[PDB]
Amino acid sequence: DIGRSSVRPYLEECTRRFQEMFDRHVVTRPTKVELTDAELREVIDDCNAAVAPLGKTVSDERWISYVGVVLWSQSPRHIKDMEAFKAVCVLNCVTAVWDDMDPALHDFGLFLPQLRKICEKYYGPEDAEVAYEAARAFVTSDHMFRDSPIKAALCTTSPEQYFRFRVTDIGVDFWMKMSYPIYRHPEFTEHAKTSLAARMTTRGLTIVNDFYSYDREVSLGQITNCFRLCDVSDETAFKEFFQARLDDMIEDIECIKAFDQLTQDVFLDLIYGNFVWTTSNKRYKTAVNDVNSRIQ
């Protein structure tokens, strides 16, 4: 129970083992994108404008905590479109607010038009439609699976059922479909649109996020977390589960290395950069705080 309410006893060791895995299997360190003050302010003002119809104010410190995943987990050496980068910054942030909101305040009529306005600001006409549909599908999925029997079944049955749910629910399909304009790389664009890009990266993103967001999520009655599949109060069982998940991440990373050079660079910067950001995000460091609290 309370023994199952936290992965704190494993925090240091799992962090060390995560990093050791990346040093061995990815090697290349992720890179932080440095926005100018003008760029950061533009992103944040677009974020505020988009969530203002929903009546909640979001502090700069909160936005900065949301945006760090984009700053850390894109692929700076391959960036060609900084407008598409800023779009991903904004879209990520405003839908992370949605992910944190009480569903009672999920106003599709007010929010969906703001998502379209973002896409139309930053993307060409064709890209705007691809990014928008993926944003729409992400916020719709997050809404419709709150207290759903489907989510309960897919999250409590097996790791295979759980990660299949997370391809969409964690947002990585959305991410790939709004991020391919950053790179203008033909192969990457196709893997993004088939969702093979998302499926290749789902476990490495999800396992890392689930470990560090476990304590917050169980305190909030949130069940979408693979470590609820094991008794985290049982050290031996946890260790076995955790090794199985490292094995999952490793197999994925090695198969990702079969993709073309630019595509695998982007895929691996995403997985490894998310890890680096996750270990520095105060959202993931106490059960409830001013940057991870539920938005009432």
In whole angstroms, give the CA distance from residue 275 to residue 31.
12
Q: 185: helix, coil or strand? A: coil
In whole angstroms, give the CA distance from residue 121 to residue 128.
8
Residue range at the interface with Cl ion (CB under 5 A); choices 21-29, 99-107, 170-178, 217-225? 217-225
CB 287 within 8 A of CB 216: yes
| Among its own copies, Mg ion, Cl ion, none, residue 209 binds (CB under 5-8 Å by kind) | Mg ion
| Among Cl ion, Mg ion, its own copies, none, residue 1 binds (CB under 5-8 Å by kind) | none
225 is in an annotated binding site: no
Residue in the structure block whose two tokens are 């969409």:
168
Q: What angle do CA 61, 67, 68 make, to 5 degrees?
A: 95
The pattern of x and - marking residues 229 through 268 that bind its own copies according to CB under 8 A reads: -------------------x--xx-xx--xx---------
Max Cα-Cα span within the chain: 53
The pattern of x and - marking residues 206 through 245 that bind Mg ion according to CB under 5 A reads: ---x---x--------------------------------
213 is in an annotated binding site: yes
| Among Cl ion, its own copies, Mg ion, none, residue 94 binds (CB under 5-8 Å by kind) | none
Nearer to its own copies, 197 or 232 (CB): 197
In whole angstroms, give the CA distance from residue 146 to residue 142.
7
CB 58 within 8 A of CB 51: yes
Helices (H), the chain: 11-25, 37-51, 60-73, 82-100, 108-122, 125-144, 149-156, 159-169, 172-183, 186-194, 196-219, 235-256, 261-278
DSSP single-letter state for residue 290: T
Residue range at the interface with Cl ion (CB under 5 A); choices 55-63, 84-92, 94-102, 223-231? 223-231
Min dist. Cβ of residue 155 to Cl ion (A) = 8
Strand partners, 101: 295
In whole angstroms, give the CA distance from residue 10 to residue 16.
10
How many residues touch its own copies under the rule CB under 8 A: the total is: 35
209 is in an annotated binding site: yes
Q: By the criterion CB under 5 A, which residues form the site for Cl ion?
A: 222, 224
Q: By the criterion CB under 8 A, which residues form the site for its own copies?
A: 129, 133, 137, 140-141, 144, 149-150, 152-154, 157-158, 160-161, 164-165, 167-168, 173, 187, 190, 193-196, 199-200, 248, 251-252, 254-255, 258-259
Binding residues for Mg(2+): 99, 209, 213, 217
